[PDB]
Structure 1
Amino acid sequence: ESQAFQRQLTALIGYDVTDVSNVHDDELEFTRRGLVTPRMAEVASRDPKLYAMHPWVTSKPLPEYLWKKIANNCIFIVIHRTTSQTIKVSPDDTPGAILQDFVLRVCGRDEYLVGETPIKNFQWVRHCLKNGEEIHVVLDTPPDPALDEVRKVSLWDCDRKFRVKIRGIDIPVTVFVEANIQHGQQVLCQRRTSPKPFTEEVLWNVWLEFSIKIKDLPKGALLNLQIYCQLLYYVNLLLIDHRFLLRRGEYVLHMWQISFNADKLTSATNPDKENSMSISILLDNYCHPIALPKRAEMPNQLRKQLEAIIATDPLNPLTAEDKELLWHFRYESLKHPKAYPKLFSSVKWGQQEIVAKTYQLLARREVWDQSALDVGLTMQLLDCNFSDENVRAIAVQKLESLEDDDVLHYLLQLVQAVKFEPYHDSALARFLLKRGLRNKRIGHFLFWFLRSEIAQSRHYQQRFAVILEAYLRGCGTAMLHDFTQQVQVIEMLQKVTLDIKSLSASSQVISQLKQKLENLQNSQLPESFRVPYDPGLKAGALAIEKCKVMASKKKPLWLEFKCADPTALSNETIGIIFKHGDDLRQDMLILQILRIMESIWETESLDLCLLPYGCISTGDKIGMIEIVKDATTIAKIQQKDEVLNHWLKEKSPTEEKFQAAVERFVYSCAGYCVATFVLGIGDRHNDNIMITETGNLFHIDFGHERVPFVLTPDFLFVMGTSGTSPHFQKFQDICVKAYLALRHHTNLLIILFSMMLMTGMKEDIEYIRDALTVGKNEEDAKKYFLDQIEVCRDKGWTVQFNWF
């Protein structure tokens, strides 16, 4: 009936936010209700014009390597109606000023050049300049903003010890309960139950007294119940609710099975009730409710100790001495923003009086608020080591600074950080909403990032579902319509990939694909859909005759689409790869880190010509990859040392284009060598590395006696020298420049890598430290890296062959 909006939202999300068949409290529903305000606040605040236009812009400097490209110091763009005309431009002009009511859209795309910013501060332009491409725009009338229409007693009075009664466990399918009280990844106190028998049901029926006072439990403390022989089952219960009240009564909680990890922190209970292990518990019964309420100077030698502590990397563990040092001199420690994580990892959270001091400490926010924004520092406070909302808010507040440009750089990482949140409604979840709804680009990518996790993760789908719904309710009639079209297409194509995969371990199946695709274009269809990994591009009908299946053991589709925009100045298709077997969420992260690195280099005016191709995880074990045109694997070129350069000349028609090719190869090869080493995904099989008919090398298939990174003799033959040329010198030089360019952001990468490991996949994270060579001077770094280069040369073709 009138509720003709909900089951729409539901099938977009892939989950239901009205469903209560798995909640044991109203936090999810409360957070649906709570999100209405910041939603309205952002919907109502956003300028309908610039929103419908979503101009993708930056405030960053136009880099030195791009400065060379600029004509005289003029720049040419062509306007179109059929008929066209060229215009000379100054790099500081405005769209409306160059215009001399009507708007400028980029040809073949849903992308606009509008608003009060210079043209040099447009992303498309900077792309066109980087690639050497021409800038093509059509005179068009601004899209109607009406299309975007938006539808419509104290706890510190309780001095008794905290107590939890374990009734017992049951499973329908040397075993004891392990009851921890946690704040972050920190264990406050820990009791246990007597080791009992192996029966599918065991009832201990004992009260357990914890050494912590009721008063001393901190907001966001977790009753973490574990089952050992040894660890096989875990479940968590926020001991304090979303209304600040201490929890009460009896609970039956179904538990996740094992086989450190962001899942282990989830307040979500297992929905599969008929198979999962459970537990019954009793919480201290009371009649009236319990709600939680709301210098001399330093000697030198100690300052030096403190300043060393502050200077260390994120992964350097703090001794108890360090912690005590940081604490006792908290007011001086406050003066340094870099001391914050280590300072808040120094507070005893299981102590009411201490937590207070911290809260009154955070009131003196003078210097933090004043400090220049540090994404690395900011990210540190959003990780699994911080479970206090006030600590987490001072981080979130710093993010507000970021221009949409930089949000899109950290979106995935930020979305994944929601997993470390203790409450469904948080400053960070809230921030993502705000930022998503204020900018269509972010909101498109938010949708997918969120939907990726919902379809694939039982530990966090409820949390992400309520946040997705929150976004959708303010994104507009326009985007709601597009998301539906996109959802339909992938919900069609994935089934097609599955059915096909089972029909093989040949040219028999290749005609079965085309036959199965034909009826999909006729019945159930959408003529056009937005490309999930590149929303500027609108795909049309399948180039049915161009589609195939691929020569891998995992069977991916090779698909070709027409462009639905008739104003596109090319006839070239849009390629996509549908794949089952490798988890694409791991690919997404790495590609995203790759973009971050490319932005890092930009700050040092370096370009390394990476190809971080589009890649969106869509559902369990399955998703899409962007097709890079004119590219081939290195292994196929081999089907040893001489052939690589010949292929390049074979594909390069002239000598300029061949010198442009080898120019391109050196940068891109250098780039991937640095990146892959830092990430520790260096040693890869030759079938997983590719190159374009133009020089650009690039890695693929990020699915997990070794070489630090793949630099081989055939690559070296193109560069010259037998196992130093004028090109091997450049390679060497730019690798050291690229390697040191990362080391200036040691902290940032450490935390991202650490975050990557916890949400995507201690001695595991420790690797990035060594790879970036922490604690060594710039000289030692150049040495360290060039030695790695030498290993690859000295080992030649060894490990390649080894893969039998």
Structure 2
Amino acid sequence: ESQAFQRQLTALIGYDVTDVSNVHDDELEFTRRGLVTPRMAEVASRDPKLYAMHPWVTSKPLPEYLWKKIANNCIFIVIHRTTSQTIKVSPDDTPGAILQDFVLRVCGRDEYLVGETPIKNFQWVRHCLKNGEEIHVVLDTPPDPALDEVRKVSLWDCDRKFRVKIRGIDIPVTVFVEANIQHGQQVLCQRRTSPKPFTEEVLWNVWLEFSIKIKDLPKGALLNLQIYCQLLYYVNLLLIDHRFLLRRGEYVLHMWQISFNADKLTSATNPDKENSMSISILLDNYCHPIALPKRAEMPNQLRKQLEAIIATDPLNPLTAEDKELLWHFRYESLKHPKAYPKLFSSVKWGQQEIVAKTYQLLARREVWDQSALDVGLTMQLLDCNFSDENVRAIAVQKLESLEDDDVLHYLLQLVQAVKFEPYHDSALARFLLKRGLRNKRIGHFLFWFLRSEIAQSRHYQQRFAVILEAYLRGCGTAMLHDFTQQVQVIEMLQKVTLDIKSLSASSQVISQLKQKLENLQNLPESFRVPYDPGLKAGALAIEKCKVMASKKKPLWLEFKCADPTALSNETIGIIFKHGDDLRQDMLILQILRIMESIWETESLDLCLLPYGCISTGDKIGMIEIVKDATTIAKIQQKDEVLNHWLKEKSPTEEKFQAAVERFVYSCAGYCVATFVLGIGDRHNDNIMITETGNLFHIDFGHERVPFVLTPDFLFVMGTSGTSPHFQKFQDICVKAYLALRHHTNLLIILFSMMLMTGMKEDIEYIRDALTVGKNEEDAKKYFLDQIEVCRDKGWTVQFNWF
């Protein structure tokens, strides 16, 4: 009756929030309760007119390469209604001024040109100008905002030393327990139990007295229990709870097994109980509830020493002297926003006094607030190394400066960063709740970015599910309708992918596929595309649908577009795959999209193709089909072969000369990008190219060479084992490489988090690849040398690949 809505949300999320069986406290229920207010606040504050039409706009400057297309200076936008007419408009002209009521929707898209924004500052206008396409719009009627209607004793006096009683470890099928007090990645104090023979049950009943006191336990503290026999099981328990109270009583904790990592920081217990390892522990209880309460300059030499510490890379660890230097002169270090991550590492979190000294130091934020926004440091303070609620919130406060365009560039990386938050309700989760609820595009990607983890991560599904339910409860009836239509389709397409895979390691398979898709089309008739929400896919082209030939078996699906106002009847091609982890490809594609923005600021377009890719469920998702594209393997199935393929598929010579240029930029782009990320040693079948000349890597799901610059690519430029194109390539390569190096800290910390949340020494790769330390001229030469490593090898490495 009154519960029907929750069972609808339950099916959208893919996990039950009301079901509380793997919970030892009430944090999820308390954060479900606490999340109501920032949803109520956002639902109410959003302009219902601009919420319904979600104009995807930017406040960033129009790039160098895009002002080349505009001349007079005017742009042509063709308005449709059967009868169409072109209108010459100034780049700085508002959409209403063009209209001279009615709205300017994009043809075949739920994309609109609205608000007090210049047309040059629209993401669809910039997109068309980049791709050299016409701006086809339609004089449509604004959508009803009615469709989005939303349904409605003190701690610092407990000077006693802390202790935990290790009762034992009950397991269904030598060993010792390692008890740790943790804050960030920094272990405060360790204690082990005496080794005992490994059996079905191992009792100890011994108390482990720690060096740290109750008073000195920081908000965010963790009792991390580990089972060593060398590490085999782990579990965590927040010593300070959500209601600021120290943990008391008996706790049985089901432990996570093994095979550093974000999964190893989780406060959640293992849901499996009949097969998992447990741990009975006792925590000292009291009659009254224990509750946590709330100059000189610097000499020229010690200034230079501190300046060198700030200027180093994030991965560079601080010594004991570096930590003392930074802490003593914290008031100076506070006047340099770049020192904050390193300074907040230098503080002794296991000392109530040193913590209180930081908390009051942070009240002098006049300098941090007034600073120019840096995503680098903001992401730095949100990682595993920072467990303090206050420090993290200073980073979340800067995320408010980010306009909807930028929130989209880091939505996935911010969603992952929630894994490092000690408590469920956090400034970050709330931040992602505001931005998702304010914007429909952000909200759509939020849904899928959260649903990605809820369905595959047993470690963080609990936390993420309460954040999804909170977003869902405020998006409005329209988005809730759209998501049911997406869930219903992917859940339908999930069975088909799995049933077909359970028939192969042919005509039988291809007939059985259409035999199943037939009893599927007879709901829904339309659904938004999870990786491109503007595009609405209609009914299937069941005759075009096939099962793909590789080691894995994906579903090549083609859907007609639901919008009849579309320019072409070109179907929407979607790959539905199983057995591969799309969570890592999502992460790689995101850094690629970030790299492009870095190049945009530096006035460069390296023509990357970061194809839509959404992780949907348990090792299953969907991938965008790139139209008129094939792999290098299919083009070979040597030197001449690619340039012969480009001319052959090219209509005019004008278009071919465009095809070789689109090749040099995209090739240089994938050369710099895949090198930095360390995914350049890839097989020919994992490198694609459009009939337009647009090259792009794929299958990112986890002798040597730095990148792929084979002779067939070189022959396209006009070189065999210099050229006017190869010189243009080398120059744009360096120009692109040096741009990414200006954002070292950003890339370093983006990669670091990517590793921990998606997948110590492995991370160190970007230090060397982004040539940390070396000057602008030394890096130019270093990259040009890596070009020559590909020239020397040629077909060697490509041949080596089995």
TM-score interval for Structure 1 and Structure 2 normalised by the shorter chain: over 0.9
94-103 or 429-438, which deviates more: 94-103
701-710 or 666-675, which deviates more: 701-710
Q: Deviations over 1:747-798 (max 9, x none)?
A: 0000000000000101111000100000011111011101100000001111
55-64 or 3-12, which deviates more: 3-12
1-side partners of 2:703 and 2:573: how far apart?
37
Are 1:663 and 2:661 counterparts? yes
Deviation at 1:348, TM superposition (A): 0.4
Structure 1 segment 269-418 matched on structure 2, within 5 A:
269-418=269-418
2-side partners of 1:447 and 1:545: how far apart?
32
Deviation at 1:175, TM superposition (A): 0.5
Deviation at 1:503, TM superposition (A): 1.0
Q: Deviations over 1:294-348 (max 9, x none)?
A: 1111111100000000110101110000000000001001110000000000000
1-side partners of 2:757 and 2:721: how far apart?
41
Q: Deviations over 1:705-748 (max 9, x none)?
A: 21000110111111112110000000000000000000000000
1:345 alignment partner, SS class: helix
2-side partners of 1:277 and 1:63: how far apart?
57
2-side partners of 1:136 and 1:608: how far apart?
26
Deviation at 1:703, TM superposition (A): 2.2
1:541 alignment partner, SS class: strand
2-side partners of 1:100 and 1:215: how far apart?
68
Deviation at 1:660, TM superposition (A): 0.4
Deviation at 1:681, TM superposition (A): 0.5
Q: Deviations over 1:540-593 (max 9, x none)?
A: 010011111111120011110000001001111100001112100000000000
2-side partners of 1:461 and 1:505: how far apart?
32
Deviation at 1:508, TM superposition (A): 2.5
2-side partners of 1:102 and 1:692: how far apart?
38
Deviation at 1:507, TM superposition (A): 2.5
Q: Deviations over 1:632-669 (max 9, x none)?
A: 00001001111111011100011001000001000000
Q: Deviations over 1:460-491 (max 9, x none)?
A: 00000000000000000000000000000000
Deviation at 1:617, TM superposition (A): 0.2
1-side partners of 2:114 and 2:298: how far apart?
55
Deviation at 1:160, TM superposition (A): 1.0
2-side partners of 1:70 and 1:646: how far apart?
33
Deviation at 1:71, TM superposition (A): 2.9
Deviation at 1:3, TM superposition (A): 2.3
Deviation at 1:238, TM superposition (A): 0.1
2:425 alignment partner, SS class: coil
96-105 or 324-333, which deviates more: 96-105
755-764 or 500-509, which deviates more: 500-509
1-side partners of 2:300 and 2:605: how far apart?
44
2:279 alignment partner, SS class: strand
Q: Which residue of 1 aligns with 2:426?
A: 426
2-side partners of 1:759 and 1:589: how far apart?
10
1:278 alignment partner, SS class: coil
Deviation at 1:125, TM superposition (A): 0.4
Deviation at 1:2, TM superposition (A): 2.2
2-side partners of 1:3 and 1:164: how far apart?
41
1:205 alignment partner, SS class: strand
Q: Which of 765, 773, 780 does residue 782 from structure 1 map onto?
A: 780
1-side partners of 2:694 and 2:520: how far apart?
36
Deviation at 1:138, TM superposition (A): 1.0
TM-score by length of 1: 0.99
2-side partners of 1:669 and 1:152: how far apart?
53
Deviation at 1:513, TM superposition (A): 1.1
1:223 alignment partner, SS class: strand
Q: Which of 533, 542, 545 does residue 544 from structure 1 map onto?
A: 542
2-side partners of 1:711 and 1:336: how far apart?
42
Q: Deviations over 1:346-404 (max 9, x none)?
A: 00000011001000100111100010110001100000000001000000000000000
Q: Deviations over 1:264-310 (max 9, x none)?
A: 00000011111000000000121111101011111111000000001
Deviation at 1:72, TM superposition (A): 2.2
2-side partners of 1:482 and 1:49: how far apart?
19
Deviation at 1:243, TM superposition (A): 0.7
Structure 1 segment 499-578 matched on structure 2, within 5 A:
499-522=499-522, 525-578=523-576
1-side partners of 2:357 and 2:761: how far apart?
34
Q: Deviations over 1:673-711 (max 9, x none)?
A: 000000001100111000000100000001222100011
* Structure 2: stretches of 5+ with no match in the other structure: none
2-side partners of 1:285 and 1:446: how far apart?
41
Runs ≥4 residues deviating over 3 A: none
Deviation at 1:235, TM superposition (A): 0.2
2-side partners of 1:162 and 1:140: how far apart?
68
2-side partners of 1:736 and 1:560: how far apart?
40
2-side partners of 1:26 and 1:405: how far apart?
36
2-side partners of 1:285 and 1:443: how far apart?
43
1-side partners of 2:132 and 2:549: how far apart?
34
Deviation at 1:119, TM superposition (A): 0.3
1-side partners of 2:340 and 2:737: how far apart?
28
What is the total number of aligned residue pairs between the two structures? 802
RMSD, matched Cα: 0.6
Deviation at 1:801, TM superposition (A): 1.2
Q: Deviations over 1:432-463 (max 9, x none)?
A: 00110000000000000000000001000000
Deviation at 1:140, TM superposition (A): 1.1
1:169 alignment partner, SS class: strand
1:191 alignment partner, SS class: strand
2-side partners of 1:13 and 1:666: how far apart?
44
Structure 1 segment 722-801 matched on structure 2, within 5 A:
722-801=720-799
Deviation at 1:84, TM superposition (A): 1.1
Structure 1 segment 120-519 matched on structure 2, within 5 A:
120-519=120-519
2-side partners of 1:740 and 1:626: how far apart?
31
99-108 or 751-760, which deviates more: 99-108
Q: Deviations over 1:513-549 (max 9, x none)?
A: 1111111100xx2111111100000000100111111
TM-score by length of 2: 1.00
Deviation at 1:418, TM superposition (A): 0.3
1:190 alignment partner, SS class: strand
639-648 or 658-667, which deviates more: 639-648
2:507 alignment partner, SS class: coil
2:192 alignment partner, SS class: coil
Deviation at 1:137, TM superposition (A): 1.0
2-side partners of 1:739 and 1:147: how far apart?
47
Q: Deviations over 1:66-97 (max 9, x none)?
A: 11001321100111111111101011101111
2:566 alignment partner, SS class: coil
2-side partners of 1:2 and 1:250: how far apart?
36
2-side partners of 1:779 and 1:144: how far apart?
57
